[PDB]
Amino acid sequence: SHRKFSAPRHGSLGFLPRKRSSRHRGKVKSFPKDDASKPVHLTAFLGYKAGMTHIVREVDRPGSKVNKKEVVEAVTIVETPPMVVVGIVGYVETPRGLRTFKTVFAEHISDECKRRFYKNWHKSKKKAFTKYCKKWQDDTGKKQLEKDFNSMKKYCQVIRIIAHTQMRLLPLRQKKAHLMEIQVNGGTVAEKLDWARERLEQQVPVNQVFGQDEMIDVIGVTKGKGYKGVTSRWHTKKLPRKTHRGLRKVACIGAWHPARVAFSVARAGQKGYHHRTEINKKIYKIGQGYLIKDGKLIKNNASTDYDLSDKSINPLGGFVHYGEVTNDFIMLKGCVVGTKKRVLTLRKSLLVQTKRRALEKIDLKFIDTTSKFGHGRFQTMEEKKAFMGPLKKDRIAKEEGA
Amino acid sequence: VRYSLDPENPTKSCKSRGSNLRVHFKNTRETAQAIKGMHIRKATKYLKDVTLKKQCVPFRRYNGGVGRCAQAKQWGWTQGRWPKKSAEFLLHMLKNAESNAELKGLDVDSLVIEHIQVNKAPKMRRRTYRAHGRINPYMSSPCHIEMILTEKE
Amino acid sequence: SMLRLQKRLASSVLRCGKKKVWLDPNETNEIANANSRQQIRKLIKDGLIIRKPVT
Amino acid sequence: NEVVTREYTINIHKRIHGVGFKKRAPRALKEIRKFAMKEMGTPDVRIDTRLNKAVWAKGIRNVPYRIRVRLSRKRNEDEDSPNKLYTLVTYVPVTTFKNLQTVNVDE
RNA sequence: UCUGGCAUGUUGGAACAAUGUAGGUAAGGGAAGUCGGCAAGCCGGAUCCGUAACUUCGGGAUAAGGAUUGGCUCUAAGGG
RNA sequence: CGCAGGUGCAGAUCUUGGUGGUAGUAGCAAAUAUUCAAACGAGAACUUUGAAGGCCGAAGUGGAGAAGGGUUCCAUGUGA
């Protein structure tokens, strides 16, 4: 007979396989549609999730109850050191799909990028690309490279760059760079190839890919949670207290007559570590990263034009379960997938941005920098020293020195 | 007595067997299969590693409920275990075969395990008490083992 | 070796429990030789068997 | 150099973290054995009974956070065992653990 | 806890997943759950007050309701 | 060639015996707890000795009896 009272089904079958992701790095499954009239530009970047904090800003939507009023918004910090271009890939369109036509690599590839080519770098002889690079130097090999760029020019419809992150600059245990193909959009195939060739072996900062207050897409792998029951995996109703043989389960897993368990029934299994793509994340800020100017280190990241505190995006005591952020970073509104240290994929939007929320220009008034290792209450160490006063450890040091 | 197989030439071979050995037949069959065909020094080293859980025996036939371990990829398999008692019993019998080779004048550094087989020995009976006043069998599964080693290099 | 008999014999001779009987760990061989109540008495007088104080 | 004595501070607190109440002191002994094996490469590690008392001094739950031990690599030729070298771990009573470095000991 | 006794109840090692058995805690609501307050929770000792209907005058009665309770230093009274 | 039968099995939840798959699976989860060193020994997580940490907490996991058991008591040796 029919369900007595209607209720919507628990969960979505649009994420059906609900397994561990086969990849640790987020994958761009659709790049923005190419427009030949636009200038040549990149469409994606690779960052690392450092942590979360909250900001203070005043909003500018006229009809709202918070119009011209100060609001507090959670943000996420994604550390994005520059990427190094090491290759070019060409693709041809076929009635069977997009097929890899020819890839060309740069003459010198750093050791951190070569680490991606080995499962045991310690035991390896580091012979990757040692014969390929000699082709860039030999006269016969140079002619083949030029012919291979020409064939890409006259046969390829899609041009991508192979780029890797620099893990020397990150405070992570891992030293192996993440490689990625980033599609080049705009212009003609010839203009794409010329753009790619000239910045081969070069560095692409994140400010040349993304800009301020633009709405981007974040691709990554969700936090892993292991084996879980239907109560946590699919959020089914817990059975009564006096249930025999288990409360945290689905009572009826199917009717008699189809005589099989359907694929649409909640079952216990793997939860988390799922590949996900969230689509509308605004860029609140693009940090500048530490730089040495006139012998003094500039820490001015996360100093707005209303506080001038001379502090860094780093909270007091550092980001928890992540080192110090010393490179360029992207501040996104809200939360993003993954653990800390998780590598995130940031790509340009596939949609046309026309709503007021997406077009509004944001300007931070304050950035929280209190410690996340507890109930922090001091923005800077200088503020804490001024409020607290001299301590016993300072007087002890003075006694030792005098 | 009579072995299952006859050596290619008895002069360059040594035999060793045992009967009614209190080891699990299913565990020993897999261990013997992993040992089969291997050089005597490499088989001795391997069986010691099985005791120390450094190398595993792939459980191919009697594999129901056997766990899955990383060391089983070396055998192109997924299920493997570390049968210590079977490895000790097969180590004792390898030492016996090596001593027989020395007795009849064969060099022990070129000895290959060319034949090894385990057979079910007669079972031994004990009992377990199984609720509602019932008694169920509690049986052991011992085995006979024979091996023939042949000079080969 | 096993000293179960000697811990029982010294317990009855010393009129204490077996938890209060102390056999010298460095004189196991000599204590193991004592299989009579009279040799247990000699070991008590030699100091090889001691009655521990109460807790 | 085979025969060598060194003094260490072992952080029992971070090697016990998360283990159950009935297993904290028993696991702290296995952690000291692991520490001695990694520092001095001998698989034969012997723990002095005074160091066993120090770990159990407050029961099976409240193990001391830090212990100061003395690792001593010596020859096993006295026993003629299959293992050629062994390490003896002894207990060093200290009043404070502040500024205590790993120190070479000679006599 | 002592005298006395024992070795954790026919095995150990590692890990800390789902479901379970046993024990807890939970914001704001406060039985809206359920056949049903089932289960759990509230109360709980002693001292000083104060106790209804009804009644076979015995009870009901620890009815109900309220206050106090630690440590330390003193004081008064109670005997051979 | 004749004579005479306790004369032919796939079944009977058939009778007796033997054997599989299940399956190296379920399981060896009631009463807080073990650790260090040494000895004997071919061999020690489990025996013994010593030192620690714990429990029974006198209506005991203590010391003795009645029924019932019948040599289980004690010493030595073995380890099928």
Curated annotation (Swiss-Prot), chain A:
GO CC annotations, alphabetized: cytoplasm; cytosol; cytosolic large ribosomal subunit; nucleolus
Residues bearing the modification Phosphoserine: 12, 303
Keyword Ubl conjugation included in the entry's annotation: yes
Chain positions of cross-link Glycyl lysine isopeptide (Lys-Gly) (interchain with G-Cter in SUMO2): 38, 223, 225, 285, 365, 385, 392, 398
Entry-annotated residues carrying N6-acetyllysine: 135, 285, 293, 365, 372
SUPFAM superfamilies (UniProt xref): Translation proteins
Superkingdom per UniProt: Eukaryota
Entry PTM: Constitutively monomethylated at His-244 by METTL18. Methylation at His-244 regulates translation elongation by slowing ribosome traversal on tyrosine codons: slower elongation provides enough time for proper folding of synthesized proteins and prevents cellular aggregation of tyrosine-rich proteins. It is not required for incorporation of RPL3 into ribosomes.
Modified residues (Tele-methylhistidine): 244
GO MF term (any one): structural constituent of ribosome
Localization of this protein: Nucleus, Nucleolus; Cytoplasm
Region (Disordered) residue spans: 1-35
Keywords: Acetylation, Cytoplasm, Isopeptide bond, Methylation, Nucleus, Phosphoprotein, Ribonucleoprotein, Ribosomal protein, Ubl conjugation
Composition bias, Basic residues: 17-30
Glycyl lysine isopeptide (Lys-Gly) (interchain with G-Cter in SUMO1) cross-link site: 293
Annotated function: Component of the large ribosomal subunit. The ribosome is a large ribonucleoprotein complex responsible for the synthesis of proteins in the cell.
Family: Belongs to the universal ribosomal protein uL3 family.
Quaternary structure and interacting proteins, as annotated: Component of the large ribosomal subunit. Interacts with DHX33.
Protein name: Large ribosomal subunit protein uL3
Gene (name only): Rpl3
Curated annotation (Swiss-Prot), chain B:
Keywords: Cytoplasm, Ribonucleoprotein, Ribosomal protein
GO cellular component terms given for this protein: A band; cytoplasm; cytosol; cytosolic large ribosomal subunit; postsynapse; presynapse; ribosome; synapse
Biological-process GO terms, alphabetical: cellular response to amino acid starvation; cytoplasmic translation; positive regulation of G1/S transition of mitotic cell cycle; translation at postsynapse; translation at presynapse
Major localization class: cytoplasm
Domain of life: Eukaryota
Subcellular location(s) per record: Cytoplasm
GO MF annotations, alphabetized: large ribosomal subunit rRNA binding; structural constituent of ribosome
Family: Belongs to the universal ribosomal protein uL22 family.
Protein role: Component of the large ribosomal subunit. The ribosome is a large ribonucleoprotein complex responsible for the synthesis of proteins in the cell.
Subunit details: Component of the large ribosomal subunit.
Protein name: Large ribosomal subunit protein uL22
Organism: Mus musculus (Mouse)
This protein's encoding gene: Rpl17
Residues of the full protein shown: 2 to 154 of 184
Curated annotation (Swiss-Prot), chain C:
Localization in the cell: Cytoplasm
UniProt modified residues of type Phosphoserine: 12
Posttranslational modification: Citrullinated by PADI4.
Record PTM Citrulline, positions in chain: 4, 15, 37
Known partners and oligomeric status: Component of the large ribosomal subunit.
Family membership: Belongs to the eukaryotic ribosomal protein eL19 family.
Function text: Component of the large ribosomal subunit. The ribosome is a large ribonucleoprotein complex responsible for the synthesis of proteins in the cell.
Protein name, UniProt field: Large ribosomal subunit protein eL19
Protein's gene: Rpl19
UniProtKB/Swiss-Prot annotation, chain D:
Keywords of this entry: Acetylation, Cytoplasm, Phosphoprotein, Ribonucleoprotein, Ribosomal protein
Molecular function GO terms recorded: structural constituent of ribosome
Cellular component, GO, one term: cytosol
Database matches in Pfam families: Ribosomal_L31e (PF01198)
Residues the record lists as N6-succinyllysine modifications: 38, 53, 58
Modified positions (Phosphoserine) in chain numbering: 81
GO BP, sorted A to Z: cytoplasmic translation
Subcellular location: Cytoplasm
InterPro entries membership: Ribosomal_eL31 (IPR000054), Ribosomal_eL31_CS (IPR020052), Ribosomal_eL31_dom_sf (IPR023621)
Modified-residue entries (N6-acetyllysine), positions: 58
Gene3D superfamilies: 3.10.440.10
PROSITE patterns: RIBOSOMAL_L31E
Subunit relationships: Component of the large ribosomal subunit.
PANTHER family the UniProt entry points to: 60S RIBOSOMAL PROTEIN L31 (PTHR10956:SF0)
Purpose of the protein: Component of the large ribosomal subunit. The ribosome is a large ribonucleoprotein complex responsible for the synthesis of proteins in the cell.
Family of this protein: Belongs to the eukaryotic ribosomal protein eL31 family.
Name by which UniProt lists this protein: Large ribosomal subunit protein eL31
Source organism per UniProt: Mus musculus (Mouse)
Gene giving rise to this polypeptide: Rpl31
